[PDB]
Design a protein around this ligand. Sequence first.
Ligand code: HEM
Ligand code: HEM
Ligand code: HNI
Ligand code: HNI
Lengths: 146, 146, 141, 141
Amino acid sequence: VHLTPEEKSAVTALWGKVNVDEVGGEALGRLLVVYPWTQRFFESFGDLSTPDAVMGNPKVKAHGKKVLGAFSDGLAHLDNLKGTFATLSELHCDKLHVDPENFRLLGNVLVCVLAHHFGKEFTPPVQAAYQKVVAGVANALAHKYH
Amino acid sequence: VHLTPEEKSAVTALWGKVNVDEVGGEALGRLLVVYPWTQRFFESFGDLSTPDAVMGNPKVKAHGKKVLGAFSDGLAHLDNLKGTFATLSELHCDKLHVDPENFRLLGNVLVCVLAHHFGKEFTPPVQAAYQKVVAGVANALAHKYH
Amino acid sequence: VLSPADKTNVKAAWGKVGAHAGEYGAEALERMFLSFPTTKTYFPHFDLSHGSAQVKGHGKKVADALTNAVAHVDDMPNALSALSDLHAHKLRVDPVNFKLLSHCLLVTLAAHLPAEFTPAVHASLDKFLASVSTVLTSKYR
Amino acid sequence: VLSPADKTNVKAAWGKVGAHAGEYGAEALERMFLSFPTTKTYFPHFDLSHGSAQVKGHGKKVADALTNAVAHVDDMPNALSALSDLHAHKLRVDPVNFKLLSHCLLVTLAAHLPAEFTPAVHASLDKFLASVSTVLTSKYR
Ligand code: HEM
Ligand code: HEM
Ligand code: HNI
Ligand code: HNI
């Protein structure tokens, strides 16, 4: 799961340029647009009927900030992702009943959002590093399911 | 994964009754029949044209025995599957060029073969423990890929 | 695509199952919940206790749907249309879980068909369950 | 199934790709080999390092196949028939890998289409690549 020192530096360098609130809203919104069954957890968020209704949904945006905020905090602990996300894993299983496949889908959408935002700066080696990260985070969030 | 003492007990108890020769031949043979693209690694094994030809193929049966023998040995390392399969992981990656998805397919076929042989004795809890094992072995064999 | 040989194998195997189908449907669900606990995230509203009448009732529904699909194996998209609508739009079960239930149905059949579960029939049943899963996920997006 | 809007979106996006299709195909392959090392098991005869002539050449072939799929978006099972046979019977690439190349194609498009890669177009392209993948794995068994 782990990254080379070169990959850790690449992840940190790119992330330093990321507006986490904005990228978070964008990633969660795109998840709900591209994989619309993921809307099943968000009936209380109101209008999700069109791509614009989803992307501009204030509750979608607010939740995206929260989700990617936790993701961002986790980048400081790449050596212990399972520990880092243990309590959120338990919560998503026991209270929220969220299929962990959702974490994998969000990871892939996030990689697409980073590519879209950064263009050529999101090089193939930078992507490879981030693929390790989102797989690690999704596996960590899945780890305490039972 | 990580087996509980109760799950470890269930795995070992059933395995003590397993004819590794038969189950190995059956598992590899059924892999090649049910997912015939897996035959790509075994052109040297000769006749694989029909299900009966595959199942009765001496080289398929010999390899099935060898593979399940290494699987069997791994059961003595349930808390360190990655360590014990590290050498074979590198071998399958660099020398044999075997997509690790094959390990996952074989694991599920093995579970089917065990159910077919043991019938009602292959209870849902026994299956659940064996699902942990075959996932663990597949993940261990995939772990050193690069 | 399900070959004519596949269809013959599936019909013969499910024919042998007969009135046990409902029981096997419940067993497959129980096997799935135990073996693949993430699938329980779709049933938090269920009673999942041992011998759960709710799970048994649901296994019967799953089995009946499969029985109908076998009976209409030449025209499954039409036979499973409403059920496909339900999973795609109401339930919104992630498509990855259909392989998990399919595997558990296959394991259940293997455990109950010692004579019939030949390699060829194993293959046909796996293809059949994948085809059912394909139809049931065809309207998701 | 691809909707009318999906097909409009795919045609527009691939149109904007234009003469860069081959470049992007090669880039997507490189992204795949780096991000998902297991996919390298299918190319042991290839130079897979950065700047590989083999990968550049193969990217063109992949791109040309996608261009043809776009041109025949309502008949991909037939337009891609030979390619499906090739992957199913000669190459025997495990079906799980198609999602990996599809994702890397998506990422490549995202990296090159700032204006065009809207959420709706993203959705349509993902559906399109999944449909191509489904066709290419339809003859495996
Ligand atoms: C071969 C695949 C499947 C078949 C044949 C099948 C069949 C059915 C049937 C017949 C129903 C009841 C329909 C009705 O009440 O009108 C149902 C409901 C349901 N299914 Fe499936 N299903 C399949 C796959 C799945 C999977 C993989 C999951 C999740 C892991 C799932 C989760 C559900 C849920 C949550 C319900 C609603 C239960 C309730 O609250 O009543 N299904 N399914
Ligand atoms: C969108 C999905 C895909 C498309 C459009 C595609 C397209 C193609 C094309 C056009 C060719 C050359 C055909 C010919 O030589 O006549 C080819 C060959 C090949 N493909 Fe794919 N492919 C796809 C997916 C994959 C995946 C996922 C893999 C493995 C990870 C793969 C592995 C190969 C291999 C090994 C060859 C042969 C290369 C050689 O030795 O020359 N393909 N593919
Ligand atoms: C598609 C579903 C889904 C995904 C992919 C997802 C992915 C993630 C990821 C992945 C990187 C992270 C770090 C994360 C973190 C969080 N999620 Ni997730 N969550 C999801 C569905 C939820 C739901 C639902 C809630 C509760 C929302 C609410 O209504 O309050 C939630 C709540 C949270 C909270 C707030 C916890 C609380 O209320 O005590 C955090 C933090 N999360 N979520
Ligand atoms: C579908 C392909 C495939 C699968 C699923 C698979 C799954 C596994 C599993 C899973 C439980 C184990 C424990 C395992 C172990 C082994 N394999 Ni695998 N192998 C596979 C393809 C091979 C091939 C190919 C060889 C070389 C065979 C030969 O005879 O040359 C091989 C060789 C071996 C050997 C002999 C190595 C040596 O020469 O020293 C062992 C041991 N293995 N294989």
